[PDB]
Amino acid sequence: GFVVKDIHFEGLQRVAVGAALLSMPVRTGDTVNDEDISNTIRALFATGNFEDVRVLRDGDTLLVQVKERPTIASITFSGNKSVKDDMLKQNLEASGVRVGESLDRTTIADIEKGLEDFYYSVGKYSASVKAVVTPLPRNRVDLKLVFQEGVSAEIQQINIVGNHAFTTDELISHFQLRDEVPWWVVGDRKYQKQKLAGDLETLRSYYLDRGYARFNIDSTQVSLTPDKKGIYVTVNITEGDQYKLSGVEVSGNLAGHSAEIEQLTKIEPGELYNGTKVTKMEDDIKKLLGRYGYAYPRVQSMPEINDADKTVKLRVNVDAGNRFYVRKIRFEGNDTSKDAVLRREMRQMEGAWLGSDLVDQGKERLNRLGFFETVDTDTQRVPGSPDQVDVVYKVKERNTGSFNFGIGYGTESGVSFQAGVQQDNWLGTGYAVGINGTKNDYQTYAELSVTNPYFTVDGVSLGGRLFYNDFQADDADLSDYTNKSYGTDVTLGFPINEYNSLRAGLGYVHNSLSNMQPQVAMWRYLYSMGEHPSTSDQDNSFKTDDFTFNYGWTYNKLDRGYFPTDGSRVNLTGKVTIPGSDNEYYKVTLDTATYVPIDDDHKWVVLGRTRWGYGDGLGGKEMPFYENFYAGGSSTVRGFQSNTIGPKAVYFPHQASNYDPDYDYECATQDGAKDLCKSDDAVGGNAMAVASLEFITPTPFISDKYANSVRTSFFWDMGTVWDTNWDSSQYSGYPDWSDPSNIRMSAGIALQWMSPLGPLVFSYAQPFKKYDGDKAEQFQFNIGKT
């Protein structure tokens, strides 16, 4: 034994006598053996203040001796190029190492090697972090982290060994990692390395989804060059033979649902094994057992292979598992966004039965808002309950507001300067506000918005615009006029289905025309409005105050957002003038894309586009010439100039304030004002009908490694505009512009990929059937107009 009269200290500096005592098990007066002293030492270490401790028996007095860890007095850097002194400083406080705390001296070489892996992720494998610790007069240390990051390492080959039915290139075609990028070009992934897991996953699926049921990735080695600048990658594989599916035998805790699972597993006998149909099945089961209360259904499938007839008998093991209940759903980190802002994206109902999906579905539904940097789930069993859980979503909040600027460069547009500012989550309420402007050759647009994405709990949005558009028609390749409009719309957005939406909203427009060079059509509209300005000059003005009911319906079941290979897109907009407007018209436009692949690999898609437009007046009035439908250039019928299809200007004789120098003029007094002049200036119509037929094929001269990056097609475009209120009789001499059987057809070849200057799209069309006064334009393009 041994009895202690006092506890006495040597080496306490920062740690108060009181803090030492409140962590020693052995008290003043206690009876202690060398075992309870070894427990005290053991304990004072567990505090984290001390570097060495020793408790010693000194007669009647227990004596505690300490050397405290040195206080961090500065953290300089000196060497860090690729990581800023602030981003590292913050990451070090997250690891305990900060200024004013004490240095974990045995973790210095840990701190060093701890930072190497930050550098090995990007590929800086030549890197290095030393740490110079300099003692200072009063038990302080100066931590200086000397970096020497190196040449980032680039991947010089991705090889595949055993590939017999597919050239090593076709396979690599689909990997996020690339053995070569091109320039002068395709924006086509980098050339660095990390997390190759998930690229072997696509290699499995390429093989499994073609009936190679016995396919196996034997090994995947990952090499360096001695200089640690180059990186090689081999994935050695074994190709199965092709196996046809025989049947599916289901076996496990089906929770007595064999009735409904025995047809979810019914597969037409003969078709090849299909690694995704398998995981669909597996998911359909987990989605059925989930429909019936079970949170975590497991489902596995090990094919019974039979090399005799070359078939696979899929043995699916079901196991519905247990049933849990959600006591609460809780949110942590939503320090700005309202509780409701996250909770409304929950497909998991709180105070109801757990879904292993609806919790994951409600996480994908959360980061796709993009209000949060990270989104982690955590399902905790409620203490004192075998089947109650809390679902916690730990969010880290992202800076939502941003300034954006984008130059694109298209023909039928010129140079687009899209630019504006946006706040995606106004003070954390899901409300979006922003001021976007786009500036064309013909247009200067500038609108301010306020949107509620959940006006109604089910997803109905109420979005208000407030716009300003100055249109200069003679830059838009139309008859010369100037519309200077502005107004405001409120618009309900109804979500209907995963593929469908409705818009309906009211609108105000102030159209303020001026500088209208006289022509027949433009002027037939004007008598209708009760305005009779001058046939023989260009100094005019029309103020129009319109009130509109707008409505729209959009349907998108495209397989892929980028290069669609399957499914249709259908947008339908229409408006009408609510009684009390200066104008009185209804407008209805409708576009249509339809992709239809012809091969299994889906590199022979057939694109069928159609565009439709129609409107007219109601009270003996007409559709404003500015609400007209045009058809030419890239967006519509290629081979032809922008807007060049349909009716043309039949011009009055006049003079403008131009002061006729030495330029070309249309039906000017200055040059011989007879009566009316026919022109090849276009005005479009109140009745468009364009409809294309593109044949998307492989791109046949470029390396297979990235041939699927570029998309050639062969299009046959045709279109028609016409003027319905054209008096064909009164103007017997001038061409019949109420006749729509004037089908303008063209045929060309398209190319698009993604260059560094942005998304690209070329066309080259010779118009074979063009009619009287149609301006051709054979090579057209955009560089991501934005």
Partner: peptide, 9 residues
């Protein structure tokens, strides 16, 4: 798109 973008507002 073109040019760039700042996210700090």
């Amino acid at each position: 798109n073109g040019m760039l973008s700042l996210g700090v507002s």
